[PDB]
Design an enzyme around this catalytic site. Structure first.
Site, PDB file in Angstrom:
ATOM      1  N   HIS A 196       0.843  -1.191   0.000  1.00 25.13           N
ATOM      2  CA  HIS A 196       0.000   0.000   0.000  1.00 25.13           C
ATOM      3  C   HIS A 196       0.880   1.244   0.000  1.00 25.13           C
ATOM      4  O   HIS A 196       0.452   2.324  -0.406  1.00 25.13           O
ATOM      5  CB  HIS A 196      -0.902   0.017   1.236  1.00 25.13           C
ATOM      6  CG  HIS A 196      -1.602  -1.280   1.492  1.00 25.13           C
ATOM      7  ND1 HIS A 196      -2.478  -1.845   0.590  1.00 25.13           N
ATOM      8  CD2 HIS A 196      -1.544  -2.131   2.544  1.00 25.13           C
ATOM      9  CE1 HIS A 196      -2.928  -2.990   1.073  1.00 25.13           C
ATOM     10  NE2 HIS A 196      -2.376  -3.186   2.256  1.00 25.13           N
ATOM     11  N   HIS A 206       4.882   6.984   6.953  1.00 19.60           N
ATOM     12  CA  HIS A 206       4.809   6.545   5.559  1.00 19.60           C
ATOM     13  C   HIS A 206       4.416   7.740   4.705  1.00 19.60           C
ATOM     14  O   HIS A 206       4.261   8.849   5.218  1.00 19.60           O
ATOM     15  CB  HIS A 206       3.762   5.447   5.402  1.00 19.60           C
ATOM     16  CG  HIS A 206       2.436   5.791   6.006  1.00 19.60           C
ATOM     17  ND1 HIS A 206       2.176   5.654   7.353  1.00 19.60           N
ATOM     18  CD2 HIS A 206       1.291   6.250   5.447  1.00 19.60           C
ATOM     19  CE1 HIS A 206       0.926   6.004   7.596  1.00 19.60           C
ATOM     20  NE2 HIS A 206       0.364   6.369   6.457  1.00 19.60           N
ATOM     21  N   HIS A 241       2.172   9.183   0.899  1.00 21.34           N
ATOM     22  CA  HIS A 241       1.141   8.996  -0.112  1.00 21.34           C
ATOM     23  C   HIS A 241       1.608   9.916  -1.248  1.00 21.34           C
ATOM     24  O   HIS A 241       2.103  11.009  -0.988  1.00 21.34           O
ATOM     25  CB  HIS A 241      -0.222   9.426   0.436  1.00 21.34           C
ATOM     26  CG  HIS A 241      -0.740   8.535   1.522  1.00 21.34           C
ATOM     27  ND1 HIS A 241      -1.514   7.422   1.265  1.00 21.34           N
ATOM     28  CD2 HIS A 241      -0.564   8.569   2.866  1.00 21.34           C
ATOM     29  CE1 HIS A 241      -1.793   6.810   2.402  1.00 21.34           C
ATOM     30  NE2 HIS A 241      -1.228   7.484   3.388  1.00 21.34           N
ATOM     31  N   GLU A 267      -3.225  13.610   0.368  1.00 22.51           N
ATOM     32  CA  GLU A 267      -4.576  13.158   0.673  1.00 22.51           C
ATOM     33  C   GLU A 267      -5.419  14.361   1.060  1.00 22.51           C
ATOM     34  O   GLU A 267      -6.500  14.565   0.496  1.00 22.51           O
ATOM     35  CB  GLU A 267      -4.542  12.117   1.784  1.00 22.51           C
ATOM     36  CG  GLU A 267      -3.745  10.881   1.383  1.00 22.51           C
ATOM     37  CD  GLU A 267      -4.138   9.646   2.155  1.00 22.51           C
ATOM     38  OE1 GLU A 267      -3.852   9.595   3.370  1.00 22.51           O
ATOM     39  OE2 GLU A 267      -4.742   8.737   1.540  1.00 22.51           O
ATOM     40  N   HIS A 280       2.861  10.967   6.701  1.00 25.64           N
ATOM     41  CA  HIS A 280       2.096  10.627   7.896  1.00 25.64           C
ATOM     42  C   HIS A 280       2.958   9.986   8.983  1.00 25.64           C
ATOM     43  O   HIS A 280       3.458   8.867   8.821  1.00 25.64           O
ATOM     44  CB  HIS A 280       0.943   9.677   7.552  1.00 25.64           C
ATOM     45  CG  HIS A 280      -0.149  10.315   6.748  1.00 25.64           C
ATOM     46  ND1 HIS A 280      -1.150   9.585   6.148  1.00 25.64           N
ATOM     47  CD2 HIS A 280      -0.409  11.613   6.462  1.00 25.64           C
ATOM     48  CE1 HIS A 280      -1.981  10.402   5.529  1.00 25.64           C
ATOM     49  NE2 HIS A 280      -1.555  11.639   5.703  1.00 25.64           N
ATOM     50  N   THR A 305      -6.869   6.782   6.745  1.00 21.63           N
ATOM     51  CA  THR A 305      -7.289   7.047   5.370  1.00 21.63           C
ATOM     52  C   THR A 305      -7.279   5.761   4.544  1.00 21.63           C
ATOM     53  O   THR A 305      -7.390   5.797   3.318  1.00 21.63           O
ATOM     54  CB  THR A 305      -6.388   8.106   4.694  1.00 21.63           C
ATOM     55  OG1 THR A 305      -5.111   7.534   4.403  1.00 21.63           O
ATOM     56  CG2 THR A 305      -6.207   9.311   5.627  1.00 21.63           C
TER      57      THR A 305
HETATM   58  C1  WZA Z   1       0.024   3.957  10.471  1.00 20.24           C
HETATM   59  O1  WZA Z   1      -1.274   4.478  10.186  1.00 20.24           O
HETATM   60  C2  WZA Z   1      -2.092   3.566   9.629  1.00 20.24           C
HETATM   61  C3  WZA Z   1      -2.291   2.408  10.356  1.00 20.24           C
HETATM   62  C4  WZA Z   1      -3.097   1.399   9.865  1.00 20.24           C
HETATM   63  C5  WZA Z   1      -3.734   1.560   8.532  1.00 20.24           C
HETATM   64  C6  WZA Z   1      -3.524   2.742   7.801  1.00 20.24           C
HETATM   65  C7  WZA Z   1      -2.725   3.775   8.305  1.00 20.24           C
HETATM   66  O2  WZA Z   1      -2.494   4.914   7.563  1.00 20.24           O
HETATM   67  S1  WZA Z   1      -3.036   6.467   7.736  1.00 20.24           S
HETATM   68  N1  WZA Z   1      -2.977   7.061   6.253  1.00 20.24           N
HETATM   69  O3  WZA Z   1      -2.154   7.218   8.595  1.00 20.24           O
HETATM   70  O4  WZA Z   1      -4.373   6.565   8.211  1.00 20.24           O
HETATM   71  C8  WZA Z   1      -4.615   0.446   7.991  1.00 20.24           C
HETATM   72  C9  WZA Z   1      -4.282  -0.902   8.637  1.00 20.24           C
HETATM   73  C10 WZA Z   1      -4.311  -0.794  10.161  1.00 20.24           C
HETATM   74  C11 WZA Z   1      -3.261   0.179  10.692  1.00 20.24           C
HETATM   75  C12 WZA Z   1      -3.520   0.494  12.172  1.00 20.24           C
HETATM   76  C13 WZA Z   1      -3.408  -0.793  13.008  1.00 20.24           C
HETATM   77  C14 WZA Z   1      -4.245  -1.934  12.428  1.00 20.24           C
HETATM   78  C15 WZA Z   1      -5.716  -1.642  12.759  1.00 20.24           C
HETATM   79  C16 WZA Z   1      -3.796  -3.310  12.885  1.00 20.24           C
HETATM   80  O5  WZA Z   1      -4.264  -3.613  14.203  1.00 20.24           O
HETATM   81  C17 WZA Z   1      -4.345  -4.276  11.823  1.00 20.24           C
HETATM   82  C18 WZA Z   1      -4.520  -3.434  10.527  1.00 20.24           C
HETATM   83  C19 WZA Z   1      -3.961  -2.071  10.932  1.00 20.24           C
HETATM   84 ZN    ZN Z   2      -1.237   7.609   5.616  1.00 17.45          ZN
HETATM   85 ZN    ZN Z   3      -3.151  -4.704   3.720  1.00 24.91          ZN
END
Ligand code: WZA
Ligand code: ZN
Ligand code: ZN
Length: 257
Positions: free
Chosen positions: A61, A91, A93, A103, A116, A195
């Site tokens: 991603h 990370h 985007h 974003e 981010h 996001t």
């Molecule tokens: C680092 O920030 C993120 C964490 C997670 C996602 C996206 C993210 O990006 S963002 N653009 O900042 O919103 C999507 C998957 C998200 C994880 C947070 C922790 C989770 C919920 C785990 O417990 C399993 C999948 C994980």
């Molecule tokens: Zn992000």
């Molecule tokens: Zn995934």
């Protein structure tokens, strides 16, 4: 599995994660005229001198840089936050062309890319519990605009060709996240969500007013990554961003006048 393509993209996410149509989805457009100043907001305190970087990886991603979050070493506090928030990873985007990539937008203007820095609320003991709480996370968003080169980003972009495909990882030690911050800490802030799926509405968003500058050469390195795994047909990792969501009455506050 979800992605950014026509068939598994943002317009499809709601099916596996209904919250996609929630009241506090991110990202959003930041209108400088409707985002008012809030005095109850305290000075933003970024403490990254104790940051211990561990590794960098491609999860299909985007690419993440993780940190050791076993102690209150690299933390975020102050501002609209309660207590401490530990940095766990950051990370980016970006888009298929310099015109798009971020974003969030400022008065409808997109930047070349967005950074981010993700932190979790220490009062929940653990990252797993944090993401499932409305105030479990604090994400520091920083815009990237094309111009001069960012010395502090060199280390990151220099490793990308070693983790082109989904699943590749590499040790990434001694990276100082302070080299990715702009001069000013002026910011906008609002309650929102991840996001990306699961799209949980557990994020206090802190977006910096001042963008950092990165060279054209630097951003182009991002576009060398692949969404796909090794041995599979190349699907370039570009446009891994989500369209802006409706504000739906939430208030965006600014730390400055
Ligand atoms: C680092 O920030 C993120 C964490 C997670 C996602 C996206 C993210 O990006 S963002 N653009 O900042 O919103 C999507 C998957 C998200 C994880 C947070 C922790 C989770 C919920 C785990 O417990 C399993 C999948 C994980
Ligand atoms: Zn992000
Ligand atoms: Zn995934």
């Amino acid at each position: 599995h979800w992605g950014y393509g026509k068939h598994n993209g943002p317009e499809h996410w709601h099916k596996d994660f209904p919250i996609a149509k929630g009241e506090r989805q991110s990202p959003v457009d930041i209108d400088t005229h409707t985002a008012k100043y809030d005095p109850s907001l305290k000075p933003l305190s970024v403490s990254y001198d104790q940051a211990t970087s561990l590794r960098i990886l491609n999860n299909g991603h985007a690419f993440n840089v993780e940190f050791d979050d076993s102690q209150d070493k690299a933390v975020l506090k102050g501002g609209p936050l309660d207590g401490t928030y530990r940095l766990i990873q950051f990370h980016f985007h970006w888009g298929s062309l310099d015109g798009q990539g971020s974003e969030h937008t400022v008065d409808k203007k997109k930047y070349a890319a967005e950074l981010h820095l993700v932190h979790w609320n220490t009062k929940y003991g653990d990252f797993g519990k944090a993401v499932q709480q409305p105030d479990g996370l604090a994400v520091l968003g920083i815009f990237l605009k094309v111009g001069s080169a960012k010395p502090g980003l060199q280390k990151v972009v220099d490793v990308l060709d070693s983790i082109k495909t989904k699943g590749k990882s590499a040790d990434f030690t001694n990276f100082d996240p302070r080299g990715l911050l702009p001069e000013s800490l002026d910011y906008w802030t609002y309650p929102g969500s991840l996001t990306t799926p699961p799209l949980l509405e557990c994020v206090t968003w802190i977006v910096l007013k001042e963008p950092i500058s990165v060279s054209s050469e630097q951003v182009l390195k991002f576009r060398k990554l692949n969404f796909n795994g090794e041995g599979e047909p190349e699907e370039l990792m570009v446009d891994n961003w989500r369209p802006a969501q409706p504000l739906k009455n939430r208030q965006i506050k600014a730390s400055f006048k």
